[PDB]
Design a binder for this molecule. Structure first.
Ligand code: ARA
Ligand code: ARA
Lengths: 164, 161
């Protein structure tokens, strides 16, 4: 189960939805102090989460997208004053030419943040969901599609931030 | 105007819609007898076209997707029995790893053909429209986005067959 400790993330893209509910089986903090081998993109869809990094804390809310590069600390979970923290996520290894699009302004350390304009929220949420659906497919082209959709999301962000 | 002959198609992706109407300004056959350097994907969205190749003819209708690889003859226009032939198209240079997804069954010579089933039709039409939108947009990422959406279409076809 990728939603619980013990799972091995390495070369393959893995995607899912973590529906944390207070006092439930997922009500614990993701705690990977040494970081991961690949990247993780995280979209909050309901509730609130608290992201911690060496004494600092950041409250993420529905519509916020976070970026965790390889080696970066992962220490986040349901915000103590929130009933839940539902977040979609995708673990991945980038294609070579994606690096310009992985340069996001940090909330702290090297943990990136992106929040689409309210008007664009629906598209990004829908796109993120398409990534999960593809990521969890078993077809010969499932992973390739998930990777492609992720690339689309990174490009849509590039257009979004440069819209003016 | 890429819609008119003499346009220089080279390394940049170019996309558009050619709304051919009988007797209108676009009512002529595209004719590139020695082909092009890049690929062209073509989706018919209205009316009917006639694709020709050294005497042979193929009538394409709404929902038909054709693939013209580099060097392939381009000779096509409004079908004589149709009042129009609106087709969306995208000229491109592929990413290296796309080649395994570009070997489509051919109507003749090496002109590929793909007709999504009725269930997949709306999604592919929707996707092609997004390609044209991205390809015609302004900014430093319009072309990359179009390339991205194109790769998606290629992958959805592989998945659909
Ligand atoms: O819930 C977590 C998710 O936030 C991401 O870190 C991947 O692993 C899952 O277990
Ligand atoms: O209308 C054509 C189109 O079909 C494609 O060949 C690109 O060039 C345009 O002029």
């Amino acid at each position: 189960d990728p939603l619980l400790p013990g799972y091995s993330f390495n070369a393959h893209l893995v995607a899912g939805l973590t529906p944390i509910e207070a006092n439930g089986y997922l009500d614990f903090f993701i705690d990977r102090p040494l970081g991961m081998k690949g990247y993780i993109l995280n979209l909050t869809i309901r509730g609130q989460g608290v992201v911690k990094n060496q004494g600092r804390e950041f409250v993420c809310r529905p519509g916020d997208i976070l970026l965790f590069p390889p080696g970066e600390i992962h220490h986040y979970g349901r915000h103590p004053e929130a009933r839940e923290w539902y977040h979609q996520w995708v673990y991945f290894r980038p294609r070579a030419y994606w690096h310009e699009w992985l340069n996001w302004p940090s909330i702290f350390a090297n943990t990136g943040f992106f929040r689409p304009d309210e008007a664009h929220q629906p598209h990004f949420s829908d796109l993120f969901g398409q990534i999960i659906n593809a990521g969890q497919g078993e077809g010969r082209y499932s992973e390739l599609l998930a990777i492609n959709l992720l690339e689309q999301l990174l490009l849509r962000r590039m257009e979004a931030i440069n819209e003016s």
